[PDB]
Amino acid sequence: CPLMVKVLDAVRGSPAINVAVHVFRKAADDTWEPFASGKTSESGELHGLTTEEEFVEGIYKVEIDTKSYWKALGISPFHEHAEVVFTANDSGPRRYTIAALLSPYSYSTTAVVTNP
Amino acid sequence: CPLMVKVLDAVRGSPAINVAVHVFRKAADDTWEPFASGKTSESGELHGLTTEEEFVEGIYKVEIDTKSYWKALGISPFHEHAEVVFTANDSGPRRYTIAALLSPYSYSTTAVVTNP
Amino acid sequence: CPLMVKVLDAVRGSPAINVAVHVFRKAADDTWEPFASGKTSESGELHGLTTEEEFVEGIYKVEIDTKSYWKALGISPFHEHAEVVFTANDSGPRRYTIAALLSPYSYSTTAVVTN
Amino acid sequence: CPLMVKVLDAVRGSPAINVAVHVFRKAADDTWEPFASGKTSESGELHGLTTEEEFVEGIYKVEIDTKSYWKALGISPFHEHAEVVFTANDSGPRRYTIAALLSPYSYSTTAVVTN
Numbered sequence: 194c195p196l197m198v199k200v201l202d203a204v205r206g207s208p209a210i211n212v213a214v215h216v217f218r219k220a221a222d223d224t225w226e227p228f229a230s231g232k233t234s235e236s237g238e239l240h241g242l243t244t245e246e247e248f249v250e251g252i253y254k255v256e257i258d259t260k261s262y263w264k265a266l267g268i269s270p271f272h273e274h275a276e277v278v279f280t281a282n283d284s285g286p287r288r289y290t291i292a293a294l295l296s297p298y299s300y301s302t303t304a305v306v307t308n309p
Numbered sequence: 310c311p312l313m314v315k316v317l318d319a320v321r322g323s324p325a326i327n328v329a330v331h332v333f334r335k336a337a338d339d340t341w342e343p344f345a346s347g348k349t350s351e352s353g354e355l356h357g358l359t360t361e362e363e364f365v366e367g368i369y370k371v372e373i374d375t376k377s378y379w380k381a382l383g384i385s386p387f388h389e390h391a392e393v394v395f396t397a398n399d400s401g402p403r404r405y406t407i408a409a410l411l412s413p414y415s416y417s418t419t420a421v422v423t424n425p
Numbered sequence: 426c427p428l429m430v431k432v433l434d435a436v437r438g439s440p441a442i443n444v445a446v447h448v449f450r451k452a453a454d455d456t457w458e459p460f461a462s463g464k465t466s467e468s469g470e471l472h473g474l475t476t477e478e479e480f481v482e483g484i485y486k487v488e489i490d491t492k493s494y495w496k497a498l499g500i501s502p503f504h505e506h507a508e509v510v511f512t513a514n515d516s517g518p519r520r521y522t523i524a525a526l527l528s529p530y531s532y533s534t535t536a537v538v539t540n
Numbered sequence: 541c542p543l544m545v546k547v548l549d550a551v552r553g554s555p556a557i558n559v560a561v562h563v564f565r566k567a568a569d570d571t572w573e574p575f576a577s578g579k580t581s582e583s584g585e586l587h588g589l590t591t592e593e594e595f596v597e598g599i600y601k602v603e604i605d606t607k608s609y610w611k612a613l614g615i616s617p618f619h620e621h622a623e624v625v626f627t628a629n630d631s632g633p634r635r636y637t638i639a640a641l642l643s644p645y646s647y648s649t650t651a652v653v654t655n
């Protein structure tokens with residue numbers, strides 16, 4: 194459980210369910226390598242992306258597929274995705290929750306980082 | 310558990326702990342009557358404010374004491390509090406989570422409303 | 426002009442036009458007394474609320490009538506209004522912009538305080 | 541000018557001054573090609589990025605160098621950068637303002653698209 198993603202919908206006042214999320218990690222040659230992916234649950238949460246063994250230090254990009262979410266609801270949104278790019282585990286393993294709050298022309302994101 | 314408040318700190322990347330929260334309900338004479346109060350836990354959550362019997366229809370104000378929070382951390386913030394004012398339980402009982410994300414000169418708030 | 430209010434709409438990607446805004450000043454008995462008010466322009470702005478002479482230190486509340494805004498657009502909203510409560514302090518910079526970004530079940534607000 | 545970027549600082553309550561901003565356009569092979577760049581002004585704004593003739597429909601990415609911004613202020617930041625990815629569409633309004641509100645572990649962004 195070192196990486197969890199939580200997504201909320203600011204139009205509905207609800208969890209954002211069935212949101213696709215893709216995680217990438219920067220490789221030594223500066224390309225973005227696929228790392229993990231999944232879908233938010235009925236609570237708007239996505240657990241089980243990685244393990245503490247797999248989730249090594251690096252630069253990670255969490256791409257939340259907001260356009261796909263809004264289009265499935267019949268809405269034409271502004272953004273293609275919401276991206277969150279950060280260095281992880283640089284002073285040892287941490288647990289990361291990446292949260293996003295979505296509207297059709299806006300989003301907010303925050304991180305909660307805890308030390309187990 | 311029909312009303313829960315969750316507070317996050319956007320400077321630290323952490324739950325906002327020990328945040329005082331006061332809830333008021335508009336009375337028939339248009340004054341704000343004290344309704345419930347409490348403090349966020351180490352997870353940034355405040356549970357147990359009210360009961361489904363007590364939490365009747367009305368207009369409620371959730372005042373999150375952000376200035377007091379920032380001052381206890383040695384920071385001089387802009388706002389006195391963050392306030393969230395809404396009509397509750399007008400089409401029957403609902404469960405409400407009021408969330409706030411705090412910075413010294415800014416805040417965001419959202420509501421998650423679910424039907425049990 | 427020491428106080429400006431800016432309102433944006435996160436659903437339509439636009440300024441929030443013709444939004445009623447009321448400013449109150451906290452009185453000695455802790456009641457809120459009306460101070461200034463108006464409606465946002467086509468750019469989502471409300472200028473001319475007060476003057477340097479009038480805008481003394483104290484606690485002010487800016488109430489933005491978001492419920493009426495959303496209903497006039499045909500959208501069901503959560504909040505009754507958004508309110509921003511702050512202290513004006515002469516030791517800090519002299520122009521205050523209160524900005525708000527509105528969604529039906531959420532809002533964001535920030536202060537930009539400059540000289 | 542069809543594209544403007546506005547950056548605000550939620551810790552200091554100010555414009556985010558001298559922030560590097562890079563705009564990229566998605567190429568046919570899905571790579572990001574540099575399109576425009578600059579540094580925000582004293583008002584937190586970056587004007588003059590492109591012209592109507594240059595700013596054709598397509599997918600664009602605006603990368604805001606928030607990590608450098610925070611470090612120059614002595615504050616420890618979470619993100620490497622903030623990036624805003626969107627499609628320019630000629631069927632919608634013609635001026636795009638991309639606004640971002642920065643905190644060390646969070647950011648908010650909105651689009652204001654007007655004629």
Ligand SMILES: CCS(=O)(=O)Nc1ccc(/C=C/c2cc(C)c(O)c(C)c2)cc1
Nearest residue numbers: 290292294301302303408410417418419
């Ligand atoms: C208790 C720790 S947890 O990880 O399990 N809970 C938790 C984590 C993240 C958030 C983010 C909330 C939130 C709320 C609003 C209004 C926002 O604009 C944004 C950007 C975020 C909330 C709770």
Ligand SMILES: CCS(=O)(=O)Nc1ccc(/C=C/c2cc(C)c(O)c(C)c2)cc1
Nearest residue numbers: 524526533534535637639641648649650
């Ligand atoms: C009037 C058009 S303009 O472009 O010249 N002015 C303008 C443009 C964008 C903004 C964005 C504001 C803002 C405020 C808050 C609190 C936010 O969270 C975010 C994400 C954005 C404000 C004013």
